[PDB]
Design an enzyme around this catalytic site. Sequence first.
Site, PDB file in Angstrom:
ATOM      1  N   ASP A 236      31.802  13.674 -58.579  1.00 14.43           N
ATOM      2  CA  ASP A 236      32.890  13.284 -59.456  1.00 14.43           C
ATOM      3  C   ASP A 236      33.896  14.420 -59.554  1.00 14.43           C
ATOM      4  OD1 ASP A 236      32.437  10.593 -60.328  1.00 14.43           O
ATOM      5  OD2 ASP A 236      30.708  11.308 -61.450  1.00 14.43           O
ATOM      6  N   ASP A 346      31.041   3.744 -58.002  1.00 15.45           N
ATOM      7  CA  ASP A 346      30.989   4.255 -59.365  1.00 15.45           C
ATOM      8  C   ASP A 346      32.183   3.819 -60.203  1.00 15.45           C
ATOM      9  OD1 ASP A 346      29.412   5.605 -61.177  1.00 15.45           O
ATOM     10  OD2 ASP A 346      30.464   7.511 -60.907  1.00 15.45           O
TER      11      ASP A 346
END
Lengths: 1123, 58, 58, 58, 57, 57
Positions: A236, A346
């Site tokens: 991320d 995600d």
Amino acid sequence: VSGEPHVQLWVWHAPGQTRPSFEEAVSNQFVKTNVGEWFGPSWTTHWFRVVLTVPEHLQNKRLLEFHWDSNSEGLVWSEDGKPLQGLTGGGERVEWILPDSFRDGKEHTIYIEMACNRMFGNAPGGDSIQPPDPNKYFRLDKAEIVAIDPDARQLWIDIWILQDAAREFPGDSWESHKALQVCNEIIEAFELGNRESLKKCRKIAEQYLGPNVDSPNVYNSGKEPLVYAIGHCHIDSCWLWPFAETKRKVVRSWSSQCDLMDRYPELNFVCSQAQQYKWLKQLYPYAFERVKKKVAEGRFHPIGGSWVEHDTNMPSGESLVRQFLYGQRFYESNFGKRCKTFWLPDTFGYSAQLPQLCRLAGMTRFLTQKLSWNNINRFPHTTFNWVALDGSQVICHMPPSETYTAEAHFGDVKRSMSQHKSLDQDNTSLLVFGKGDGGGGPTWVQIEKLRRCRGISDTVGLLPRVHMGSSVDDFFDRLERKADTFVTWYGELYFELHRGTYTTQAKNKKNNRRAEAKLRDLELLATIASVQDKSYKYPKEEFDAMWENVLLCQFHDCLPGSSIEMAYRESDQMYADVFSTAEKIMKGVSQVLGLEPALNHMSTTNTVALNTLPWPRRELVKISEKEAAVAHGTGPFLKLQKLETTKPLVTLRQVTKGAFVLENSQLRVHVEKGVITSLYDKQANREVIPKGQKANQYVIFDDKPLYWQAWDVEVYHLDTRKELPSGETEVHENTPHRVSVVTRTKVSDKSHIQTIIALNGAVEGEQSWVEVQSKVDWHETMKFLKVEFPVDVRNTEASYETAFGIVRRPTHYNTSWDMAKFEVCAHRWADLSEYGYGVSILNDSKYGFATAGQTMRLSLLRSPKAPDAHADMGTHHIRWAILPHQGSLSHVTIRKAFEFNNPTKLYSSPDAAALVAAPPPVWLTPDSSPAIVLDTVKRGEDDEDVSRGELPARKGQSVILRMYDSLGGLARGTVVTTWPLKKVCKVNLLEDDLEVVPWENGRFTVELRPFEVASYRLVLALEATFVRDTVQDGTVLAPNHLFEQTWVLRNTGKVAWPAGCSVKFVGGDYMGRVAVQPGEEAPFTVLLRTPYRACRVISHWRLTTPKGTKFGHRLWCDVVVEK
Amino acid sequence: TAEAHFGDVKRSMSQHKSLDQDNTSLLVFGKGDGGGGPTWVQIEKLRRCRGISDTVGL
Amino acid sequence: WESHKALQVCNEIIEAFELGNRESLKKCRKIAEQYLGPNVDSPNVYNSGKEPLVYAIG
Amino acid sequence: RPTHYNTSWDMAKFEVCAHRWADLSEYGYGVSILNDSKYGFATAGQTMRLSLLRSPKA
Amino acid sequence: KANQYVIFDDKPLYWQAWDVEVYHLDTRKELPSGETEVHENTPHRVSVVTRTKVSDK
Amino acid sequence: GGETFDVKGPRPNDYPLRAPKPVGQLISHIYKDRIAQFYNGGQYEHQNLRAMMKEDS
Ligand SMILES: [Zn+2]
């Protein structure tokens, strides 16, 4: 060995929170330290010089590692300066294998750059989403040299997998009992002192796992594989750490992955987010070079084709197009090929038009696993055809194991089939294993466990067979050839979690929308200027910089507002840079584009108004602050009229002293103490607000979600509704062209609202809106502030705007499938319309919306605390508007929403009469369908003066138009251009020509299917190689024929092929069941059968050495089944 | 007197209580308690069962 | 996946059977062969040489 | 009514009851199949289907 | 091709006259046997007529 | 059959751009209960395999 004679470590502390490069770090002064010290506050970095001297009695121990367990992450650098391997302090990745040249007491030195933060940020331990603690300290636990017994390691993996088999296999079948018996026989055969007992135990376990599980050859058994395992590392970009920490995480993970792929010849790796590739290329050139070498070697597949793993709900359509364009251009320029799979495992929800954009970007495949997190409705499919609004379809696969960070447990391989929801149509599935959410990739433990799993499935065939040498492309190619029978899903894939993500961090969403609008405006203006004047260079450098920053800020954890404070400080800096660059670009373009300096004492004859919207426009502009004028026109520049007649827009107080009537020529608004108690439409003589209710009503809820504070707003929050009553209205503006009343509402102590309700003078044949702007001083805690509009329109369905079209959603909570949609995402307008009449609430900075049975509700502000302790504290400027429109939802709402989000700006000019009178550069004929939106005009990416040299460039000047229909009906249009046209072609999102269209006088016609996004280009005036094989591609065979495929391969390499060197099926459609000097050619044969159906089947093969490593070109068998 | 059903072959392992020591088992099929022996239906069903186990080995 | 494949084969058999015709029976048997095996209607199915676990005796 | 079989709640509506007309319309254009004696109707993704005759026996 | 006669096999589970089940959608079969000819040709109304053979009888 | 620097892969798949028709997930238990009617001696004795069992009598 751990002492000071053998392992001596010096340390150097980085000055502040800066992260110096290796060049300027090893030139400092290190001070001696030792195991047991505590290092640095959080986010600081420390460099360790580690000098190792392997002692005399460890030189021949068959495996030497350096165990380093500072409880945080780190990166190992060689003396030269090459990154070598990542390290993590929880025990997951603590060993670095010594490179076989340390086996002499010469005291070799390495560096370890430790970052004082754990795998998941710096929360006070336990939660990992609490706000980071600024004063965490990390202990250097172990820094020793370990000689490891490889046999014990292999036996440990063996017995681990065996125990999992004994527990997870069905208790009523013989497999679990046999596993238990083998485990018992291993336990009784192991004695502590002896070391041969380890070899005996491994031999015992072989009777259940297979002869040679500890080698890659286990994957070459040639049996039918059902689960395809692919390594994966989801980093991320800014989740719980700044962006710089992400720049470090990328290298410290991909270095480990490259090292592993050197050790294990069957591991394959996928990583998305081309932006991370660019970071690696800029900051760590050696790591990028080795990554690119792996990519060319057929491993380390880059897929995803997007700049970042962006959210798909909030960003506008042009943002999604830019994501695809920049990602694919980067992949094509750096690596040879271009991705065909959309990787997005995600993202919080997927817009209904995503499959169309994917098909237009050359990507026919889609992968995701987020929908497994739905806490209300289990998503019913695993492999399906996802169909967009226009009908374009992609193949979506959701790994049945519900994670993208599968621990490669035995249970995960079992669940890859036990939880498969689409076994009727296909039984293959993808197992994505690794350590995501900022972690490093797969570890050696996972690879060995997968080897053991395949050994189990080969010897006692109850586990689904797992395969590791293949790629995602192979799996999806196998899926693609039977996709006509897959289930279809139409419309948006609604994610039933993280619904508060539409509202958190309002500043970021406002900045994102402003940046999108400004970028569109600037691109259009720069295109006009560059085509008009040859001396003005199209600013491709600056546009690329701003677009990259905007797209990065659209990451699926930055824009959704679920990050820590430091991430948003960096994103604020990014947006400030974007807007400064936009100001510079606009100044240059205004210098060239005629001349549009600034605003002075106005003259209504030397000033124009910038339009930037592709339709005739007619609105009220606010020149000469006392007075106002009418800006009307069609081009990018509009002239003004300076009206003066009888007064429109009256405002009058009732004897109630607190109630007002703002009367337009089209609307009458009765405003009580802060709320719109009545809204009468004077065109369709009907009341808009139901009797007894009050529109534009501030309500507050208690948020308190279950776990994810910044992400979630839960359904039960709807129960704690509470109206804020404290208004008391008074006049704010009373000009003969605009009236507005102002109200103050007290949310609570230290939190208040000031609301302005305004009505503009009506204009001929243009629906007028009621505009509301709120200054909210917001300091609440775990509250949720929304605004309500009851609209007296009965309909079971409400229309919302999404990227490139309209989504339609229920308003009744009939089933759980509809109760799960209690809060939805709408971009610029939400419409509730009955047959002949509708009301649209159109905003400019808010995305959360909820229509529940005649009551539209716009989500304004949230105050979470978990990742950010001061999420939305401060002063917010919010704008929205109520637009009651005759007729059903039509072009009026679309045009009005665009106008609301793009206010006209005035600009003086030395000659504002030639500029206005000139015909527009690109426009649509008035007789064309109003549903067409000519969203962007942009110069081509490769025009010999815009090229930047990244990719081969075309010769002349070209202009790209993206037009889409916004209403969902077949739209006919005629596009008129004043530019001297040489040719026109249809292109996809990557600007590749599709077909030529005919044009007459710069008047080519366009036909748009419903919700289509057509785009037009206007051109203005060991090595091995393949040789041949027996059965060609596309030959036709009997339904169940038995045949043989014979390739012939030439060496064309310096080295020589080892003895075995066979072909071992790393591919898709299974069809099994029946040395060479650098000069000559070897034929290889495989025996195959055609499957039980008329279709096309494709099997991929590859030469492999008889020890596991694969090499050479890729081979395939291509047949058609006649039936 | 197992009817040679698919369920009987499945239960010959699902209900085996001594799988730790041995996994083989005997399936005694026919029509007992005064009845005649196996019928052709049972023999054909056993053939199909073995075909299933050979093609899709569950 | 075994039960789902069996269901799919059953569906393909049902849709391939028509009342009047008699060749449809041979076509249906050929369809079922993809789940039962090539020659289930013969004793040779017992000579595949694989490990047997259940011994059937009349 | 939906025309896409997205969920079981929509797959259960594979055949619906319409009285005198069934309309499939996009923004600016539609097609209506209008009858005088038939009630069964089914719209499944651009294909309207009017149920004409059944031949049960029970 | 619009106005296309198709035939399905009904065979519901238990309630013959009541039920038509979802699986019936799998047995789609088009009736092809048309061969068109003129039926009426007045200046205010035209119409063609076709015969399609569902099956014997 | 393999890469020759003139072909990067096999001839591309014919995956249609637009989905032709919607297809739904088949309800498991309904389909499972349907199978038994293909050979049972219920109300379909004269329309299922039982009708085809006897050639003549
Ligand atoms: Zn993430």
